[PDB]
Symmetry: D2
Subunit: 395 residues, 4 copies
C-alpha cells in the first residue's frame, strides 16, 4: 500500500510495481488493442463487471491503469481515469455529469478551449453556463440556480495568475447541492490538492507539468470511484471516446517520476525570475503568487505548497514593446504550452489574441504588454540575462 509513504516516495512508486510475469522494473508498454480470454466464462465474467481483468484498451489497460492509480494517490482521490487530452478530461467529466436542462457556474478566467466549450458547445446541447469572477466567491453563489450541477474553477488562473479559494468555493457549491470540479493543471498535485480542500473532482492536462517533457498530449480525472466508473463506462466508452494511448500513459508515468524535483526547480527558478522582474524599471507589473504584492498572497500561502512555475508580467510600452521583447529572446522559446523543461514565453496580445479587439482582450485580463512565462529548468541567471537582454532591447 503506497498511500503510506512520503510524497516523493509516492511519486516514484505509487501505482507501480515490478511486472509479476518477469520482474521487469519499468512498467511494460502494453501497446495492444485486444485482450484474449482463457475461456468463454472469463469473457462473460469480465464484461458484465463481475470479474476484474482487462478486455479492450478503450475501456482499460495495465499501463494506463498504473498512471491512473498513481495520480489518484497523489491527489488523495479514490480513482483515476486517463484521457487523450486535458480538454478531453474536462469534457468527459462535464458531459458525464450534465444533461439537457442542467446548468454550470464557471470561472471566467479559464483556459481558452474550456471557455469555447462552455460558451458555445454546452448551450448547444441544452446545458447553460453562467460565467463569474471566481476570485469573489459571492459571485459564485449569486449565479447558482436550482439546475446547477457543477461549479468549475481553475487556480491559479490565466492570464494574471489570480487565485480561487477552493475550500470556500467547495462549501458554497456543496451547500447548494453542486459538485466542485477543479482544474489543477498549473499546480500539479505536488503543489496543490483540491480534493483535500473539499473539491469533488480534479482534472489535469498532463500535457503540462505532470508529464513535464513537452512530448505528450494527455489528461487525467481524479475523484470518487462511483463517479469515475461513470466517466469511464459512459463518458469515455460512449460519449468522447477520448482514451489515452498506452504509450502516452507510459511516457507520462516516466515523466511524472521527477515531478517533485522538477516542481522544486521550476518554483525556485520562478521565484528568482519574478524577483528580478519586480526590480526592473521597464516592467510595470509582475503577477506571481510568490511575490508579496500579489493581491491574494496569503490565500496562496494556505492553499499552495509552492508559488508555481508560471509568471506573467507587463512591459513598459504596450503592444510594440511586448512584440520587440518576444522577438528578442534567444534562450526562451516562443510557444503556447507550459510546464516543459525548457523555458517558454508567449505574448498573447500579438500572438494568440492578435485579431481580437484591444478592449475585448482587456476585459479578458490581457493587456497589450502582458507576457506569460513558463519557467524551465535552465540556470536562472541564464534565463534572467536573456530576459534582461530582450527587455533592454525592447525599450
Amino acid at each position: 500500500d503506497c498511500r503510506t509513504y512520503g510524497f516523493n516516495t509516492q511519486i516514484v512508486h505509487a501505482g507501480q510495481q515490478p511486472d509479476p510475469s518477469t520482474g521487469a522494473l519499468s512498467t511494460p508498454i502494453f501497446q495492444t488493442s485486444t485482450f484474449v480470454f482463457d475461456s468463454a466464462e472469463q469473457g462473460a465474467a469480465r464484461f458484465a463487471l463481475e470479474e476484474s481483468g482487462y478486455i479492450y484498451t478503450r475501456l482499460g489497460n495495465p499501463t494506463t491503469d498504473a498512471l491512473e492509480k498513481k495520480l489518484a494517490v497523489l491527489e488523495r482521490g479514490e480513482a483515476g481515469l486517463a484521457t487523450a487530452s486535458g480538454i478531453s478530461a474536462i469534457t468527459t467529466t462535464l458531459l458525464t455529469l450534465c444533461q439537457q436542462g442542467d446548468h454550470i457556474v464557471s470561472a471566467s478566467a479559464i483556459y481558452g478551449a474550456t471557455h469555447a466549450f462552455l460558451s458555445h458547445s454546452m448551450p448547444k446541447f441544452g446545458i447553460n453556463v453562467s460565467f463569474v469572477d471566481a476570485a469573489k466567491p459571492e459571485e459564485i453563489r449569486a449565479a447558482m440556480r436550482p439546475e446547477t450541477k457543477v461549479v468549475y474553477i481553475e487556480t491559479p488562473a490565466n492570464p494574471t495568475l489570480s487565485l480561487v479559494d477552493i475550500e470556500t468555493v467547495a462549501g458554497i457549491a456543496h451547500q447548494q447541492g453542486a459538485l466542485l470540479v477543479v482544474d489543477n493543471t498549473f499546480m500539479s498535485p505536488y503543489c496543490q490538492q483540491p480534493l483535500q480542500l473539499g473539491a469533488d473532482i480534479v482534472v489535469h492536462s498532463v500535457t503540462k507539468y505532470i508529464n513535464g517533457h513537452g512530448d505528450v498530449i494527455g489528461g487525467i480525472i481524479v475523484g470518487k470511484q462511483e463517479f469515475i466508473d461513470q466517466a469511464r463506462f459512459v463518458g469515455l466508452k460512449d460519449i468522447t471516446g477520448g482514451c489515452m494511448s498506452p504509450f502516452n500513459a507510459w511516457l507520462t508515468l516516466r515523466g511524472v517520476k521527477t515531478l517533485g524535483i522538477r516542481m522544486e526547480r521550476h518554483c525556485e527558478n520562478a521565484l528568482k525570475i519574478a524577483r528580478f522582474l519586480e526590480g526592473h524599471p521597464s516592467i510595470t507589473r509582475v503577477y506571481y503568487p510568490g511575490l508579496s504584492s500579489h493581491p491574494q498572497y496569503e490565500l496562496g500561502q494556505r492553499q499552495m505548497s509552492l508559488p508555481g512555475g508560471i509568471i506573467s508580467f507587463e512591459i513598459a510600452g504596450g503592444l510594440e514593446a511586448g512584440r520587440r521583447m518576444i522577438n528578442s529572446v534567444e534562450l526562451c522559446l516562443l510557444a503556447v504550452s507550459l510546464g516543459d523543461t525548457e523555458t517558454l514565453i508567449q505574448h498573447p496580445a500579438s500572438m494568440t489574441h492578435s485579431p481580437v479587439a484591444p478592449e475585448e482582450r482587456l476585459k479578458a485580463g490581457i493587456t497589450d504588454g502582458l507576457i506569460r512565462l513558463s519557467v524551465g529548468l535552465e540556470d536562472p541567471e541564464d534565463i534572467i540575462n536573456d530576459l534582461e537582454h530582450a527587455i533592454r532591447k525592447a525599450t
Copy 2:
C-alpha cells in the same frame, strides 16, 4: 500528387514523402506537444488561420497529418481527421453536426457502443435518434423528419453481416436534405468506398483493419474540407478532445502500408473458411458476403471489391454448443476485436451478451449458437483444422 497512381502505390506513398530536413524515409515520430514559432508575427499568423504551419498537437501534427492525408486519398475525400478511438471519430462527427433539437436516423445493426451513444447519450443532449432496419431503405425514408440532419449506417453490419445499399441510402438522405455518414470499419477503403457511392462522411475505427496489427486504438474521419475543419477546430478542439497521439498515428501509417496485401489474404482465407463452414453438417448457418446464399449477394458484388475478412456462423446445438466450441479452439484466440493478423473468435451469447435476456438478444440478431470469426493471416488449412476440431468436439 499521389492521387494519380494505382491503389497499392497510394497505400504505400499517399500522404508520405522523405523528410525535407534529413531525407529520412520513414515519417518521423513528431512526439511533441508544443511547437516553437520564429517570431511573434508567425504565432499570430498561424493562430488566426492566415498561415499554414503547426501550433500544438491537439490541433495538428506532422505525423498525424500524413495519416490524415493518406486515408483521405484512399477514400477519395478532400480531408482527413484522426482521433483517439473509432468511437471518438463517430461522436466527434455527430456532436459537430448535431445540436439540441436535431434528429438522426440510424441503422439498428451497428456497433454496440455506437448504439449506446445514440440510444442514451444523444437524447440526453436533446438530439433524438430513430433506429431502423437499414437493409430496407424505405424504413430509412419513413423515419426521416424535418429535423433530421444525419442518416447513419454501417455496412457490412454486425452480427449477421447484413448489407446496406449506400448509393440508394445516399440519394434518400440527400433528397430530404440530410448527410450520409458511413462507418466503413469492416471493409477498409481497399474493399469499399462510401464516398464514391455518394456518402458525405466516412468514419473508421483504425483499430481494426487499417492498422491491422492489434496494437493501436484509433479512429479517422474523411470528408469535405469544410466539414473536416469544423470537426477539427470545434469538434476535437472543444467538444471531445479526442486527438490521436503521434505515436499511434505513426504505428497506423506503418500498419496501413500492408493494407492491400493483408485484405487480399484476409478475404482469400475467409472465402475458404466460409466454404468449409457451409459444407459442415454441424453448422446450421454461415453469414458471409462471398457465399451465394447471402441474402444481398449481388449488392455486395456491386458495392464491395472483396467479400471481407469477417464470418459469422451458427453451430448445431445453441448456447452450450457455441460455448464448448469456443472453449475448444487452440489456434483462434478468444477476443472481441477484429481486423488483427491473428484469427480471433467470439461467442456473443456466452460472452458479450451473456447477462442479456435470450429473446432480448434474438431481436438484436444474436442467436444462442452465433459465433463471429475475424479471419487472420494464418494458413487457412490450419484455421480450418482448428475449427473442425473444435466443432467436432462441441457436438
Copy 3:
C-alpha cells in the same frame, strides 16, 4: 508448440502468445533495463544459470526473446539471438568463433561492411581471411587450411545476384571440419532456409525484409543452442555489446507478421519488373534469379522457394546513362537500403562507389551502368511506367 503449423501460421504465432499477466495480445514492450528479484536466492539462482528468468536487458528480455524464438522456428534452428545491427550479428558470430591464429574462407561478393570487417579488422586481431568466388565451390575447397574455422557466404550475392550452392558448400566445409555461416538477409526464411541445407549458423540483417518497414536497424543469429549461448553470454555480453533494444525487437515482431504476404508481393512484383526489363532494348543485362537466362537458374529453383525482390540491371550507355536514369525516377527512391515496402533504387557507379577507380569497381562486379532495384509493394505497372519513363529519358 508452434513448430507444427504451416509456415504462415508460424510467421503469425511462433514465439508469441497472449501475455500471462493480462491477456494482452500484442507482446508487451518490456522497455526496461533492470529486472527485480523476489529473493536473494532468486538472484543467485538466475546468475549462475541454474534458473530460467530475466536479469538485465543486455543479457535477455521478454520482448527480444519472442523475436528470437520466432526466427529460430522459421529457420528451423534451435535458438535465436537478436543484435543491434546485421553487422553486429555477423561480427558477434565470428568474434565468438574465432581467435588469434584462426582462419576464414569467405565469398568475395558479400556486403561491403562485411568485406571491410574481414579484409581489415579481422587480420588486425590475428585472424586471417581468404576471399574466393563462392559460386565455384572448388575455390572454397582450395582455400581451406588446417586453421580454417569458418566458411562464410551470402546468397543471392550482391551486386549481380550470383548464387552459392549452400548444400554443396556445407558438405565441403563440414568435411574439413569447419562451420558454414550463411547470411540469409536477401531471402528471409520465407524464401530460403540454409540450416535445412546443412548450414550451421544463419545471420540476418533484420533491417531488410524480416522487419520490412524501413524503420529498424537490427540483426539476428540462428543456430544450435550451444553456439547461441556462447554468442550471447560471451559474444554479446563481453565482446560486441550489440544488444537489440526491446522497442526494436517489438517493431521487428510486428513487421515480420506480414513477412509471408510481403515476400509474395515483392517477388510477384519483381518477376514482372524483371521481365519488363529483359524486353527493353535500352537494358543490356538483367540479373534476376527468376529469369531463365540466369547463369545458375536451376540451382535457384532447388534452393529458393521464390526468386526474391531484388533486381540488378545494366543500362545502355554506362556511367552517364545510369546517372541520368537514376536522377529521372519520380516514384522509386534513391537510397542504399533494401527490403522496404517502398521501391528503392541505387546506381553504385555514381553513388556508393563513385570515387573508386573504374576497373577497381569492375573487378568487384560493379559496371558503370549497373543499377540495383529493391522492388516494393507498389503496383508493378506504376513501378514499370516510372522505370520506362526514366530509361527513355536517360537515352
Copy 4:
C-alpha cells in the same frame, strides 16, 4: 552555440533545437533505417565524406546526433558517439584503438563484464592486459610497456567506491605515450569531468544515470573528433556494429533533461543515508565519498563536484546477515542495475558472486556482508526507515 551557458542550461538545450521543418520542440524520433537522396550526386557526395548529411542509421541519425552533441558538450569533448550498450561503448573504443600485439593497463576494480572482456576476450585477439590497483598510480606506471596503447580506469570504482586520481594517471599515461580512457558511468558529467582533468576518452553506460529511468540500455563515447570518426566509421560500422536505436537515443535525451536535478537529489539523499549507516551499530563499514572516513576523501573533493548516489556498506554478521537484510527490505528493490529513480539494492555475496569461492571474492573486494545501494529519488526518511527495519530484522 550552447557551450556558453550554465551547466543546467546545457543539460536542457545542448545539441537540441526546434525542428527546422516544423518547429516541433521535442527532437523528432527519426525511427528510420534508410535515408533518401535527391540526386545521384548527393549520394556520392555524402558517401565519400565530402558532404554532411545522413545516409543510414547504423552510420548516423538526427536523433542520435542530438544525444551525441549534447553529451560532447557536457563532458567538454569535441564529439560524441552513441552505442547499443555501455559494454559496446567500451569495446568499440578499445577495439578501435588496439590491434594484435598492443597492450593495455587496466584498473582491476572495474565493471565485471569489462573485466571478462579484458581478461578473456582481449588476449584471444593478441591484445594483452595487465591489471593493477589504480588507486596507487605507481602500479599503473610499473605495468606500462612499450606496447601499451591505453590505460583504462573507472572512478569511483566498484564495489568499495575507491577512487582513481584522474589528473595524475593522465600525466603518467601521456608521458609513456598512452591514452587515458575513463569510464565515467558512476558520476555522470554533472559530477565529474575526466576530459577536463586530462583524460582522452570518456565512456558511459547511459543505462545508469545519464538516462536515469531504468528503461534504456545504451552507451556513449566522448573525445576528439579524429578518434570519434574512427570509432564510428571503423569501430561501429565494421567491428561491433553496436549502434543505438533512434528511439533509445530519444529516451536518453528525455531522461538526461533532468540529469542535474536528479543527481542533486540522488547525492543529497545518499549523503543522508550514508550518515545514517555510519551511525548504526550493526553496520561495520560504510563506503561513500561524502563521508570523512573515506580513504581518499580529499581527492574526491577535488575531482568530483558531488559524492554520488552509490553507497556500499557491510552488515554485522557476514553472508547470512546480508541475505536476511536483503530479503527484508520492502521499498528498496533487489536488482543489479544502478542510477534509476527507484532505490536499488544488491548483496553480491549471495547474488552475483554466490558460486564464487569466498576468498576468491574477498581478493576482489567483495566481503560476505557487503551490500551495494543505488539511492533513488524517494524520501530519504522512507529509505532509511526501510533500511533500519531490515537491518534490525537481519540481526
